[PDB]
Write a protein that binds this ligand. Structure first.
Ligand SMILES: Nc1ncnc2c1ncn2[C@@H]1O[C@H](COP(=O)(O)OP(=O)(O)O)[C@@H](O)[C@H]1O
Ligand SMILES: Nc1ncnc2c1ncn2[C@@H]1O[C@H](COP(=O)(O)OP(=O)(O)O)[C@@H](O)[C@H]1O
Ligand SMILES: Nc1ncnc2c1ncn2[C@@H]1O[C@H](COP(=O)(O)OP(=O)(O)O)[C@@H](O)[C@H]1O
Lengths: 525, 525, 525
């Protein structure tokens, strides 16, 4: 259709207004003292929340161009979220600060590319600096502490997460489920995990979860593109008569077969979840054989000769519970016999022994690791279902934070790491004047997080920011108690990885955002 | 004509808008670092200035309600200027802060009477506190220093003012003059000062000066009311032949006579200035006799028998110079015989000796004081008339500041003394909640001048205010150097009297403002 | 009346619009390749012109904001022109460039007063740099060359100015006059100069000349304030009988006497021009006595006793000619006896010998200089009256340029000297970021004049500016020949004084306008 186009400073100010609207919408909820925000519901009561992610997913603007700026900040915030799992408000605030300053500089007539280059230099310097300032979290006690603070200061959740972390090692797989008894339970059962996502979002049985949980499902293994709907018809009849959930792992799924499965899920007669084949080529087939071993299933490939039509209920594997996340998938207690799994472990281990390629050897090593380590299973213990699910969600976010911190590290919360980095790197210069201006933009930009936190606390942001700048080390201003002190001593912490990713994504989005001219759109009808 | 009436919250917010407009327009120029402001001029180039008084005298609003609010806040600011001579901007800023907060509270529904009483108590406490915090300035050294800083850090002006203060004693009279030579000149000649102004503003021959300077005039003493201008008809004809300025000291002058003389001055054939007779009854007559002795004049009174028509040129007194300020008038080098003046001094001396009533002794004592001390005159010395004018203005404002300081005292400049007072009086509680709220309003409101100066310096208001509050004694913040330190060391000081009067007038105007409900005004045509 | 107020970015952008409008209007005509502009004329065909002052003096906006913007820019430019005489377009262009950049930076949140301080540092550095770069013009040949350049490549005018300069010495004064003969005439007669102008513009007999030229006028010497019209009635009748122009030199002129002189000149019964007395006090009286000696007049003073009423035709002086300039005035061939003038010169010489005050000695020295050296008159030689007038104007402004060059010096023309200055001062760093930014603004600012000149030549400005920047010394770009080369060789050079003053005034006005926010205006009607 006829598409409008505007470019130059006018488009820049429009997109600036849009991102400003979104930033004002989301920044309020930052911090403990982040104020409540009320969001719509087409029926019934409006919802009340302090979670910025809901605000981001629910916000869009009537004006096209402002809406598009809002979408830029929204998608980069979501990228940060899926990268780490928290701190989305922090990333959005950083983005607003950097982008507002960059636009006002561009209004001053500076060269945009020089500003972008200076920003890139400043942000990479900050990344390496905070990497230096990172503190390892390998010790169990700090893991318990971070899990505690993430779960609204619940020490039991931290203890359980730490124990599970011990059980399955540093890079194990942990899943949480509902426990019947009032006491928490923990058990290591061999399972599987791999990074693949659902074919369509429509498979999500619990939209709030964002994932598909299936109990006692039947798993289909395939190394072929599922061109036609006639291929899986016997399997569909089989799972219809079985009356149980169905999981599919295929090299590819076409739009038509997926759409038919979507129609089937809306029919509710059969609930089908489909995922892509992990790995590539030979390695893909090798872990497909691993899955067949784990579930007692059979691998169906075009090259060997068998097809999906020649599929029986026996041919498919099985397991006790599978979860299909946004881009991950895990399986728990595959029916496949442990002895066959051990034989496969030995085969892959001797393959490692004869391995000469480094990357293939690493693939085999991680394959045996995921195959032998298994999966830890938490079972939430409480009285009523409401607190069952509350504890479940708290455990989920806590373990996400814990694995994030374990992966990279941890620093003092309150954004104090950012301002400390700013004080350290204030002297960093650029090749030319405009690059230096962008450097200064970045250096004064990451004061915004604690500033907005203080604003949500009601105190004057500038005074507290100056006070923190005066202090050194891990000294800052507890928002909850509204008093100064060392965050580490009082348990306030934040993973290094989440802050690093947030800053990187904010810098990247701002760099591409400032350098845009032609904000095209469709005719407003 | 027709008129309307407005009242309620809408009325108060109208007042608030008007006073806010004027307060911003003037406060932008506060401080030595005060921002410039551009003023109209129907003919030729517009003016650019930093003086708040110029801004104040040229503000009126299209809307009647905003206009009247601005008019009355401007009026009280002018009252403050008349009290001391400086600190108009500070007074207006104080007024803005207090009225804004108080009307906010009035919107919050608290009893306005309670707030007025609370702020009255708070301001009285602050006044006595700053009186306790006053520092004497009787020594010539501090006199020279304050005169120096007042005259744009000109030590020669301060030295001259100190010398004149020594010459004419603690409560002497000092008058500025243009000196022919390049060297700065000082002299002492018997003059005569009294607290009466011109009857009509039209008399002001030098409106920028705001006074009437007449050289070698004829002075007419009249202890009667000027019922008709025919009483003046003969004598005026005489001064038409003399071609010299004319001064009249009259017990009263009826409005029609004033109009006739104003017409005669618009024609300017006769340069007539009239002033009401100070004193009261017997005191007025005795001091008029003193005037007759001083100038060689003669008192014309109805009861004794002589009349104004029967007045000759020789009957009028004379003096080498006279100046008529807005509410004061001084005379320099009265022609009248010094021996006769000394005889009159002796006569009033025996009157003091025989005087038993306290106020009779006081009035006779001040009479002999003003009769014997004379007037010290400082004549500017330089090569160019431009420097003559600027140095005249500098010496003028400097000696007003010096006498203000001598009258009561001197304290730290920049309003830091107000901050110290507020810190001292943070404990004062009202009889009930609302009175205490008003007290809080007052004690947090006198922080405004420092904040405004910080804005005029571009620094963070809250940060600097907190820094000053942390400090004790006179530890303030030199704005010119932009450095913290003891205020007296760099010597930026202010008279106690001017700050006290400004705060008192701001308190009064805010108190009456809060209890305002109804404006009656002409329809906007 | 009720006034509107505006403050903040709205005020700044209004000012920006006004300055941009006038800057285009004035900068269009820069260069010998400058364009043409036609102005209003209520009757007859309007005037096409090229002069910067001609276009500038009629510029004003219907919108009051932009109007007063243009007003103060125009007035600063005009007083800069009064200082030197030329470079009006250059001053306006410099002001526009600096203020546009400064307001852009202010819109970028830069601290205004810091920018002003950086501008101050930059301009003082530029002044010292250019004065170091100045080239003396004491040699007569360069004086003739610059006179030729100013006078549209007329070597005769520059030559004649050179011989006149020789006749009256380096610091002499030369006045142009109409010459009867085809050959130009030169003479030296005992003239007089003093720095006082007409009391009102209405005395200007030739508005284009901007002065009051009176042939054979009677001179009235007065050392008193002329209070009333009654005093000069007898002299008015005497000069009406004489049927000749009248000049008054008076200590002070009142408003009413001035207005009556104005209406009497509009009646034209008497063509009287009044001027304030030069100097101050004793020296004023002494050189007034010198005037009486020179012209055969007599000094009338109140102190001595005689009155202006007691004035006869003999008492008044006389001279062959007088010209009251804007702020100075000249007299030609006073009637007073030469022997008396020489005796007075000797008397003042012995006063110099006994003079111990340095400044008084300098005053006496310049007194004897202006009394003895006199004035050289150049009488234009040509055939027809049109060339009489045009060559008279050419001689006048060429002499102005020549004296301007003599006072300070001369540097490379076409603004290339500014480019060299900027290159020399590229390294100057401010105390902080904002001062440095202002310094950069200033350094790029004085490139605009050269760019504008190139634009008025039609060539691309940036390439020529870069070419000049690469070149060193005085290698500039002759606009007329449209080619590069050493600026001195073709001799297009500019006085150091005019450029210095123009840049200083532009910096002053720009700094003032940057640091102002509030702005009043009358109601729009
Ligand atoms: N007691 C506290 N001390 C320091 N920072 C806090 C405290 N409580 C909340 N915060 C701030 O909240 C920020 C993020 O809060 P979070 O609950 O993750 O919101 P979001 O999920 O939107 O990022 C952290 O960066 C942290 O600085
Ligand atoms: N550098 C400075 N340091 C401290 N005080 C200052 C400075 N500049 C101005 N002030 C304070 O501001 C007050 C008012 O400033 P002033 O220029 O007098 O405005 P106004 O003439 O309207 O009173 C003064 O009492 C003075 O003490
Ligand atoms: N051929 C040229 N070469 C170099 N400079 C020129 C030339 N023509 C004009 N200019 C420059 O233009 C400036 C202003 O020219 P002028 O005619 O004086 O305009 P204005 O009267 O407005 O100052 C001068 O300083 C001069 O150096």
């Amino acid at each position: 259709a006829a598409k409008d186009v505007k470019f130059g400073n006018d488009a820049r100010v429009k997109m600036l207004r849009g991102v400003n609207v979104l930033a004002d919408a989301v920044k309020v909820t930052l911090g403990p003292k982040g104020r409540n925000v009320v969001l719509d519901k087409s029926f019934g009561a409006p919802t009340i929340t302090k979670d910025g992610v809901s605000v981001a997913r629910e916000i869009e603007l009537e004006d096209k161009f402002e809406n598009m700026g809002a979408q830029m900040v929204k998608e980069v915030a979501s990228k940060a979220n899926d990268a780490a799992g928290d701190g989305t408000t922090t990333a959005t605030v950083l983005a607003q600060a950097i982008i507002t300053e960059g636009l006002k500089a561009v209004a001053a007539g500076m060269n945009p590319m020089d500003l972008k280059r200076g920003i890139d230099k400043a942000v990479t310097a900050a990344v390496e600096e905070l990497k230096a300032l990172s503190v390892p979290c390998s010790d169990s006690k700090a893991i318990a502490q971070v899990g505690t603070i993430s779960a609204n200061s619940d020490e039991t959740v931290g203890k359980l997460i730490a124990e599970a972390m011990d059980k399955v090692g540093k890079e194990g797989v942990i899943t949480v489920e509902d426990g019947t008894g009032l006491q928490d339970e923990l058990d290591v059962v061999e399972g599987m995990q791999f990074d693949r996502g659902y074919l369509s979002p429509y498979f999500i049985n619990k939209p709030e979860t964002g994932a598909v949980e299936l109990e006692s499902p039947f798993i289909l293994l395939a190394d072929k593109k599922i061109s036609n709907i006639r291929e899986m018809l016997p399997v569909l009849e089989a799972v219809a008569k079985a009356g149980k959930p169905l999981l599919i792992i295929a090299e590819d799924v076409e739009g038509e077969a997926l759409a038919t499965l979507v129609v089937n899920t809306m029919r509710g007669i059969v609930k089908v979840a489909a995922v892509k084949a992990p790995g590539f080529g030979d390695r893909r087939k090798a872990m497909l054989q691993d899955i067949a071993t784990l579930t007692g299933g059979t691998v169906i490939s075009e090259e060997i000769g068998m097809e999906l039509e020649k599929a029986t209920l026996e041919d498919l594997g099985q397991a006790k519970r599978v979860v299909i996340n946004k881009d991950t998938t895990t399986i728990i207690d595959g029916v496949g016999e442990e002895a066959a799994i051990q034989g496969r472990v030995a085969q892959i281990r001797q393959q490692i022994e004869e391995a000469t390629s480094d990357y293939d050897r690493e693939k085999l090593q991680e394959r045996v690791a995921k195959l032998a380590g298994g999966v830890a299973v938490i079972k939430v213990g409480a009285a009523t279902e409401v607190e069952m699910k509350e504890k479940k969600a708290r455990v989920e976010d806590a373990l996400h934070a814990t694995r994030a911190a374990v992966e990279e590290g941890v620093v003092a919360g309150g954004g104090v790491a950012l301002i400390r980095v700013a004080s350290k790197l204030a002297d960093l210069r650029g090749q030319n004047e405009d690059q230096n201006v962008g450097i200064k933009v970045a250096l004064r930009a990451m004061e915004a997080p604690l500033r907005q936190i203080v604003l949500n606390c009601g105190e004057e942001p500038s005074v507290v920011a100056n006070t923190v700048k005066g202090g050194d080390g891990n000294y800052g201003y507890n928002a909850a108690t509204e008093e100064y002190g060392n965050m580490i001593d009082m348990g306030i912490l934040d993973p290094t990885k989440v802050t690093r990713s947030a800053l990187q994504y904010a810098a990247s989005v701002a760099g591409l955002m400032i350098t845009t001219e032609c904000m095209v759109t469709d005719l407003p009808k």
